[PDB]
């Protein structure tokens, strides 16, 4: 019979200052709608923590760069290599088709519609036919020394992804990282107050990495904001 | 090997095998990690105990699908090990099952339960 | 870099210095400090906060002139830093800067003293 934050807010009447960042959208929904009543998006929003990581491959290499390692830390080569220079490879769309397959061949499902641009001809990764016609014409190249290493590497051991497919929500574009920086410390949504909570039990085992990405981000923006004003939040 | 297959479940064709592997790269250049093993294969001589050839087994594997299993979900399992018969090994392989199953228990995070004492 | 001449400031003399860079790099022998540098230039991306274009561009080096240089001597002149806008590398600068003093602090002993607080 303890009320929580909505609830306060609900008899204080304050309205739109709560943020809710959830991967059960769907059962946080249900159980806000019979507490707070039918009126209840005027108290709290629900925003989505899954990630579309077609469209941030900087974060897959991120997570799958500082998982588990099991007793002796052996951070391997390939990744070490992918995780610097994928900047530099974006400007490249040869080299992007293998990070792209390599995400396909774990199991992210990809949105409908998507096309790379594989040696001189599009391929659709999102239709089954094209994906295997994508498939063999990776063989075909792969046959003499080419540019072994690096992005062939991710796509040879594309295992790595496979713990990325419950983060992953095709059609997203979302970035929620930077949605929480623009709700604390945004220019336009300067004071005025901003409650978010984060329900970091649906995030699973990226809680850790993206908590200490996400107060990285926040602390660095809070110095520059220094002599103009403060970060002002808890 | 090189670009020839060699049966070692064979004495003639393992035999082969260690005359092609020895006799080529007689230059003494290079001797990394994998040649240096060879040279000193005697170090793997005590697994022989605990050692059975062919099952694809790794008992570990089956003690991680038992307590965290996705078909084995609920059941209460309980698995009970007999530590003095694997000698002066038990400690290791008592490490890395915990190890794996907490690893596995990690992952399985935000989904469902570990459940298990 | 070679024998060619470049201007990193251009953009395109800057991608003809990567052409030349990478384009020759392709045998990966005894990769050393410089190479394993430039494959990992991003861990100098946190320095875009403190950099400004210049020549005499060092507060370091303007510190110690105003503290310790001969033309200063006597003046009796008050340095304050405002270490917060520094951000995570205040501490770093501040060690440095003590450092640097101190070393001319040691090179005028027998001339004069350094004569600050």
Same mark, same amino acid.
Not at 70 to 98: C, S, T, V
Not at 111 to 122: A, D, P, S, V
């Given at each position: 019979?303890?009320?929580?934050? @909505?609830?306060?807010?609900?008899?204080?009447?304050?309205?739109?200052?709560?943020?809710?960042?959830?991967?059960?959208?769907?059962?946080? $929904?249900?159980?806000?709608?019979?507490?707070?009543?039918?009126?209840?998006?005027?108290?709290?929003?629900?925003?989505?923590?899954?990630?579309?990581?077609?469209?941030?491959?900087?974060?897959?290499?991120?997570?799958?760069?500082?998982?588990?390692?099991?007793?002796? $830390?052996?951070?391997?080569?390939?990744?070490?290599?992918?995780?610097?220079?994928?900047?530099?490879?974006?400007?490249?769309?040869?080299?992007?088709?293998?990070?792209?397959?390599?995400?396909?061949? @774990?199991?992210?499902?990809?949105?409908?519609?998507?096309?790379?641009?594989?040696?001189?001809?599009?391929?659709?990764?999102?239709?089954?036919?094209?994906?295997?016609?994508?498939?063999?014409?990776?063989?075909?190249?792969?046959?003499?020394?080419?540019?072994?290493?690096?992005?062939?590497?991710?796509?040879?051991?594309?295992?790595?992804?496979?713990?990325?497919?419950?983060?992953?929500?095709?059609?997203?574009?979302?970035?929620?990282?930077?949605?929480?920086?623009?709700?604390?410390?945004?220019?336009?949504?300067?004071?005025?107050?901003?409650?978010?909570?984060?329900?970091?039990?649906?995030?699973?085992? @990226?809680?850790?990495?993206?908590?200490?990405?996400?107060?990285?981000?926040?602390?660095?923006?809070?110095?520059?904001?220094?002599?103009?004003?403060?970060?002002?939040?808890?």
């Amino acid at each position: 019979t303890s009320p929580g934050l @909505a609830q306060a807010f609900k008899a204080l009447g304050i309205r739109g200052r709560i943020r809710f960042y959830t991967a059960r959208e769907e059962a946080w $929904a249900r159980r806000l709608k019979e507490h707070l009543g039918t009126e209840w998006r005027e108290y709290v929003e629900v925003l989505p923590l899954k990630v579309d990581f077609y469209h941030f491959p900087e974060l897959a290499v991120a997570l799958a760069y500082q998982r588990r390692r099991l007793q002796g $830390a052996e951070p391997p080569q390939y990744l070490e290599n992918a995780f610097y220079n994928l900047e530099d490879w974006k400007h490249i769309p040869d080299r992007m088709a293998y990070v792209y397959g390599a995400l396909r061949k @774990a199991g992210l499902t990809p949105r409908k519609g998507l096309k790379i641009k594989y040696k001189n001809e599009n391929y659709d990764i999102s239709e089954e036919k094209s994906w295997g016609n994508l498939q063999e014409a990776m063989e075909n190249n792969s046959q003499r020394g080419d540019n072994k290493g690096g992005a062939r590497e991710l796509y040879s051991r594309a295992k790595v992804f496979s713990f990325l497919r419950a983060f992953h929500a095709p059609g997203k574009e979302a970035n929620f990282l930077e949605t929480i920086k623009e709700d604390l410390l945004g220019e336009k949504t300067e004071g005025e107050g901003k409650v978010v909570i984060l329900d970091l039990p649906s995030l699973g085992e @990226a809680a850790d990495f993206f908590t200490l990405r996400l107060m990285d981000l926040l602390f660095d923006r809070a110095v520059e904001l220094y002599g103009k004003r403060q970060a002002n939040f808890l």
